[PDB]
Amino acid sequence: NPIVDYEFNQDQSCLIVSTPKSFDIYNVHPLKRIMSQEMPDAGTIRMLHRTNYIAFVSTELLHIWDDVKKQDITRVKLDAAVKDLFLSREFIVVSQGDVISIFKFGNPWNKITEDIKFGGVCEFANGLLVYSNEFNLGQIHVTRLQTDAEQGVLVKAHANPVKMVRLNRKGDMVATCSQDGTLIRVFQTDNGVLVREFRRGLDRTSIIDMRWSPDGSKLAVVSDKWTLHVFEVFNDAENKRHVLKDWINIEWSICNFKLKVSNDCKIAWISDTGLVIVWPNRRLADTFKLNYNDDEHVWWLQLNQRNEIPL
Numbered sequence: 001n002p003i004v005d006y007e008f009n010q011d012q013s014c015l016i017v018s019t020p021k022s023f024d025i026y027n028v029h030p031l032k033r034i035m036s037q038e039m040p041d042a043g044t045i046r047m048l049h050r051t052n053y054i055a056f057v058s059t060e061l062l063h064i065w066d067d068v069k070k071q072d073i074t075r076v077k078l079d080a081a082v083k084d085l086f087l088s089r090e091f092i093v094v095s096q097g098d099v100i101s102i103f104k105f106g107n108p109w110n111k112i113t114e115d116i117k118f119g120g121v122c123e124f125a126n127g128l129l130v131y132s133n134e135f136n137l138g139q140i141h142v143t144r145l146q147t148d149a150e151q152g153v154l155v156k157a158h159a160n161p162v163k164m165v166r167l168n169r170k171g172d173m174v175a176t177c178s179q180d181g182t183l184i185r186v187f188q189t190d191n192g193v194l195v196r197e198f199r200r201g202l203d204r205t206s207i208i209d210m211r212w213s214p215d216g217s218k219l220a221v222v223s224d225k226w227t228l229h230v231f232e233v234f235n236d237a238e239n240k241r242h243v244l245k246d247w248i249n250i251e252w253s254i255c256n257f258k259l260k261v262s263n264d265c266k267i268a269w270i271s272d273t274g275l276v277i278v279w280p281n282r283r284l285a286d287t288f289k290l291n292y293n294d295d296e297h298v299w300w301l302q303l304n305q306r307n308e309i310p311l
Helices: 236-240
Strands: 005-008 014-018 022-027 033-038 045-047 053-057 061-066 071-077 082-088 091-096 099-104 122-125 128-132 139-144 153-156 162-167 173-178 183-188 194-199 207-212 218-223 227-232 255-258 266-271 274-279 284-293 298-308
Touching (some): 061 091, 173 207, 255 298
Antiparallel strands (some): 014 022, 082 091, 139 153, 162 173, 227 255, 266 274, 284 298
16 A cells, blocks of 8 residues: 655656555656556565566565566575665666675676675666765765676765765766755766756755756756755757857856655656656655746746646
């Protein structure tokens, strides 16, 4: 009945959840369920695009499910409690305890390099790994993974320790924030160079979620103050990579929205002007429109719709 874990597609096309009895997978826009599979002990739950493969943690090892023939194709023994889990067509990436482990996806599913001590914050997306330093928690590591190996880069990102971290779809940019929740920063992943800095507000908050638009142009952000912020990271020209003269020649949300609330959530971009917020406790999916007046050059958000999540 209740919802144990939940996560999006790499795409945000779908949302997967686990209850005590099951794991279910939905379409995000619009919300109807696609699939339901009964299962005990489904905990931390992840999918792989829209492929037939799903991973979950028994509640202590890692089941790799194949939904065609309906069976584990492997179980993987885990040393510690699990925090984060990422699938790629050639890596399974797991943060357990105080270490990040990386297995081969397929094959003998072996452990392809040495467990990684990290400060407890990490993302993996499209071949790129970001994690805080074991000791200076406001520092960040960024490195590409390669088969054909060759089995990275180190960024001083925040004064206070990193809260979370969020790659954009292509992989070239990562967003950061700290337990301060005031400054939000963006780095080129080729080299860890600060690209752009923003302000959420003046007081301190903890950021619940951040996400990029398919575009790569914008970033959504939600603080426990329950205000949704959108930032314009790059405008059209900046983004399409044009020239811009007088670029050389000698920042806040473009819009925000106060949320309707009664503790945690996740944001999906269903389009380059639409978002969905998911609330686990209420099993509820808010959909927001992102409007633009081109006479003035201004943006506003509205809340189109609230749909209950069928279980």
